[PDB]
Design a protein around this ligand. Structure first.
Ligand SMILES: CCCCCCCC(=O)OC[C@H](COP(=O)(O)O[C@@H]1[C@H](O)[C@H](O)[C@@H](OP(=O)(O)O)[C@H](OP(=O)(O)O)[C@H]1O)OC(=O)CCCCCCC
Ligand SMILES: CCCCCCCC(=O)OC[C@H](COP(=O)(O)O[C@@H]1[C@H](O)[C@H](O)[C@@H](OP(=O)(O)O)[C@H](OP(=O)(O)O)[C@H]1O)OC(=O)CCCCCCC
Ligand SMILES: CCCCCCCC(=O)OC[C@H](COP(=O)(O)O[C@@H]1[C@H](O)[C@H](O)[C@@H](OP(=O)(O)O)[C@H](OP(=O)(O)O)[C@H]1O)OC(=O)CCCCCCC
Ligand SMILES: CCCCCCCC(=O)OC[C@H](COP(=O)(O)O[C@@H]1[C@H](O)[C@H](O)[C@@H](OP(=O)(O)O)[C@H](OP(=O)(O)O)[C@H]1O)OC(=O)CCCCCCC
Ligand SMILES: [K+]
Ligand SMILES: [K+]
Ligand SMILES: [K+]
Ligand SMILES: [K+]
Ligand SMILES: [K+]
Ligand SMILES: [K+]
Lengths: 332, 332, 332, 332
């Protein structure tokens, strides 16, 4: 009922305000800023840069022609040589500027040996043109390769389940790869999200509490080919230790799940996220198997991926009740 | 007898089906998609992009010439100036389009100061041409650098062995580097693959069970120069604890081995994989040494890399038998 | 009073001297060297490279024209063909050199089929031009993407605090993200900086002593959306164990804080640093909450980020006193 | 006396032989292969690629001119239009090929609307030219950024020392950064190298034995500004446990030291290595302090970096002797 901290699609539900220094901080960070904005704005920006330098040098060449007197004698003659042939006005200056910087160089408008300043300006513009190109190439390459997109070929089950596995009460959710290309050095994490008040009365608007997926033993590291069911064994140290099936219909909390790993092709790290609300957690359920063997290989049927079935033999009490009860029986 | 989950060459043996959303998910992920397809398709795609934009602008310039009336007066005269010189029809329009976007700019077909729209279109096409170039460069750079190729200069022994080392029964396989360039931050993992039924009757089509290579102590991290023999000591926590030489000819299971690390030049992570079936594991064997010293250095003879010899003194029972037996003797 | 090892802005306060081999070591490392210098020097260097090769080949073409005799017959005639058309002197040679290497290729100055050496030199310069371009592109891309800039969209609280949380005395500082884009695989570290003398009398000018943020349990790994308060519980192993509120006004030491993680877009690791002097640590204080819920989402108010309030119930003695005192009471 | 496995400069002392499949394995890995070879070979290879495609298309255009009959009428007339203007023979064909692929496009030799095949070939060559460019750019960028070069601005002390620190016998060596730019996520490892025979008689030509630098506690992770002394406390689990000052003049072994971390600018991982022979380890010595404070900052004097002084109070026995002796005294 409270609210969702992280959407099922991985998107975070918080917005920032009253940030103070953001513009100056975004300028020092401008590259990050630049690759974060939408494609259409990034490109708009670069085409502006091209446009602006074309106009600028165009203006320079125009001025040079003006003062040198080339406007009235564009192609020269035996007695007169222009700084740049065929610049008759501003459009021509602009065209020349475009043809030089882009290195198209049609040649109708062309530099001559006449004016050291025009030759100089052609040197500057060629360099400046390489610089801008380099920036545009860099930004495009970067933004293109963005690894977070890989998270959309990665999959979490719509639900998480609670069931007995190997004698232990466990929280389980399913991750899968939608591509035949690997997630290298993949590993999982999970957190329980909810506000709480400490014993000193300090109010924590949202506390983030680890959910042990096997980090200490290195079992958080998975080799992901066909879908894996991720397991949190609920025990003395689990924030879920004292929670039973009925506490699930009542309580308001959220479990954030994460899967990190490197996109095989680029070895770049992507982070895939989802979330399970208390109401999205199915007590006493098990995931339908997606994997099966055929003659020469194994196949994953992905239409069973989200599916679960009831296991009525599942205990309805907390792992705490389960432990303590075990010790009334074992104790008498 | 069951089947192989991972081929000796590292290739995974599973195929995906009934995937639902794949096309839309592959489009949001399109870059990953694009660098995953074969070189010939990726290139085909880019040349299509070039072709398509050339044709398109060619078409534009053609239309402009048409309406302006340049088709009937390609080179102009004292009284008439075309939007783009020498466009006499569609081929010429197309050529002009190619020469502008590629920045070849022969110049026979050439823009004039006459039509703001033609000049404008030359501005747009130059920008658009830089964008496409940038994409092609990005994709090629990425696909070219793909780190998984490095896995083919990395090597696993064809067999794994079981032998006593330093008083402990151990599973061993050999990894090696085929290049004089390093694998940075290299480390190993192994898993035992097989289906199993839990005590609650839940059927796991393939369970992946860690094989402890030294993670807790950090001994999973290796410095790989000449071939290292990787060691799994079989003990109370080893899934192999209760397995003896005869259980090996009988049982059906598989051990997946992994070696991850960064290609020295690019510091990109590669994952190298292989697999040992129960029948590919040699009980009571040891690897032939590949390393030997000469006057000023050490040399690795790689023709001994896969070779093993029998060690008949090796115990034929399980590490479990071995432990418990030790405590009948030590116990009486 | 001593001095600050790391500035609040993350900048390190040490300078190096008497380095010996620096120039030769910087040359072998030249790329790193090159991307470390300021933008204006890096660019100055590349434009020098362009300039130098233009001049050089310009010189070559000039010499070729000279000896071949093209200077006196620039455009040739029925009886004579120049090596490169229209090179009348050095400026023209230079222009030709620029037009070829940049691939502008106006065409007024143009290579002919006449001299194998001129054609050859055009081949060499085209290649050489691609090489230099490639270097400039590489350097610019790299320097542009530098991940340390991301650290300026990351934030530490101006102060650190000491307060009871969940029955334990803790040192706390606050980190936050100023962007809606993630820090992937983020984690924290902290060190206590100060000189000390060992029991053998060895003087360590500055010793760096770990401050346990949860590494053993993996709690150093944070998922950072809205600001997290980082917690050091002061206990038997904490270098702060024996320090009380009064020891804070007296002692001279420093706590260096670090947050590392990958910029989402580029998956490149950035390191963000700050520092708290003893005098910058507020005993008996708690951070003002920045996070609050509204109808459909959560919002962070960043104007409360640095703010703290007094918690007068906080004990003023050391965690050591606190422990030992607990055992006089529990002991009688 | 035996031999050095890793040189002081980090270079590994082993060579590989009898490798079998190397060529085919190097071809699948060709990119890695290509960025590993020397600059002069890599460039030679690309200029070959340029040369080869220029020649090839040059040949095509020549053939086209030949059959079409352009060789005898290079510039055409009112009644005849060539496929490509001004191709009079092979040199001209070659020039045209160069001018098109490089996009120089002088324009004297120029495509016409006449032959669909010539136009087609201009399309193919433009694309092919972009592809090759892209490869060359990729390879150069990669090879340029190689992170291992960073290891030459990183430094190990020429010697390692053995001395008491804080009541414990420790092996110590010194690492330092020669740049004002950081090594991000830096950490250390060390190994003891030597051949040995197991209790089963198995001969290990060189065994690599971990030297505990603090991995379990996370103290292997260092924040490196001014030089750090790395510490191996010699204890029950140290392979050096039973080694005393005299065992050092006698025994033959080697300690390999490693420092890994990401180059700040590129966030690429570099590995820096060195080695200490038994004879390069100084028993009863301490490093001279390089760090000192001045008015507004700290400075590192790098001329003291390798220097050590004698500490005559250092015990000359093994950590084993030291422990056991402690328990004869404490025991009576
Ligand atoms: C010719 C000029 C055409 C032009 O300017 O752009 C059009 C097109 C769309 O870009 P557009 O402006 O719609 O920007 C993307 C769009 O908003 C996606 O929906 C976002 O993905 P997600 O839903 O947030 O995951 C993505 O987020 P992020 O990737 O920025 O985070 C945005 O960049 O850009 C191309 O694909 C290259 C062609
Ligand atoms: C001119 C146009 C020529 C042209 O279009 O391509 C030809 C050639 C071969 O590419 P091709 O289409 O055969 O694609 C590669 C081929 O299938 C390899 O066998 C694959 O390696 P592996 O066996 O799966 O390891 C590789 O897999 P991945 O690398 O995609 O995963 C494929 O990309 O491409 C070049 O090398 C650059 C030249
Ligand atoms: C046209 C030629 C114009 C030209 O040559 O450069 C001007 C401009 C400024 O560069 P400039 O020389 O001032 O160099 C940067 C400047 O010193 C910043 O203040 C530094 O940031 P910080 O305060 O240390 O964080 C940065 O450090 P680092 O990033 O090198 O570490 C320096 O690179 O460069 C562009 O931005 C691209 C345009
Ligand atoms: C114009 C054509 C000039 C030309 O072809 O190359 C010359 C020059 C030297 O390159 P060169 O062929 O000598 O190759 C490098 C040389 O052997 C270094 O000594 C090596 O460093 P290290 O000692 O092993 O650390 C380096 O090893 P790695 O980096 O390959 O591992 C080699 O690449 O290359 C440039 O620097 C770019 C200019
Ligand atoms: K031209
Ligand atoms: K890159
Ligand atoms: K541990
Ligand atoms: K060009
Ligand atoms: K051109
Ligand atoms: K041109």
């Amino acid at each position: 009922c409270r609210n969702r901290f992280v959407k099922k699609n991985g998107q975070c539900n918080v917005e920032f305000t009253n940030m103070d220094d953001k513009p100056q901080r975004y300028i020092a960070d401008m590259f990050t800023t630049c690759v974060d904005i939408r494609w259409r704005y990034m490109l708009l920006l670069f085409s502006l840069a091209f446009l602006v330098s074309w106009l600028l040098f165009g203006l320079i060449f125009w001025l040079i022609a003006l003062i040198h007197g080339d406007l009235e004698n564009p192609g020269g003659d035996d007695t007169f040589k222009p700084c740049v042939l065929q610049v008759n006005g501003f459009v021509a200056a602009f065209l020349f500027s475009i043809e030089t910087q882009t290195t198209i160089g049609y040649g109708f408008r062309c530099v001559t040996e006449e004016c050291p300043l025009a030759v100089f300006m052609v040197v500057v513009q060629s360099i400046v043109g390489c610089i801008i190109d380099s920036f545009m190439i860099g930004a495009i390459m970067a933004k293109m390769a963005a690894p977070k997109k890989r998270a959309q070929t990665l999959l979490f089950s719509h639900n998480a389940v609670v069931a007995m596995r190997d004698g232990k009460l466990c929280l389980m959710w399913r991750v899968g790869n939608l591509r035949k290309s690997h997630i290298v050095e993949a590993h999982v994490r999970a957190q329980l999200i909810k506000p709480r008040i400490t014993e000193e009365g300090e109010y924590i608007p949202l506390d983030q509490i680890d959910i042990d997926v096997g980090f200490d033993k290195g079992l958080d590291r998975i080799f992901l080919v066909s879908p894996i069911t991720i397991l949190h064994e609920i025990n003395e140290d689990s924030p879920l230790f004292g929670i039973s099936r009925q506490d699930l219909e009542t309580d308001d909390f959220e479990i954030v799940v994460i899967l990190e790993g490197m996109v095989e092709a680029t070895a770049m790290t992507t982070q895939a996220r989802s979330s399970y609300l208390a109401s999205e957690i199915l007590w006493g359920h098990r995931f339908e198997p997606v994997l099966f063997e055929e003659k020469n290989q194994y196949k994953v049927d992905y239409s069973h991926f989200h599916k679960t079935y009831e296991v009525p033999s599942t205990p309805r009490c907390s792992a705490k009740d389960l432990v303590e009860n075990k010790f009334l029986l074992s104790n008498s």
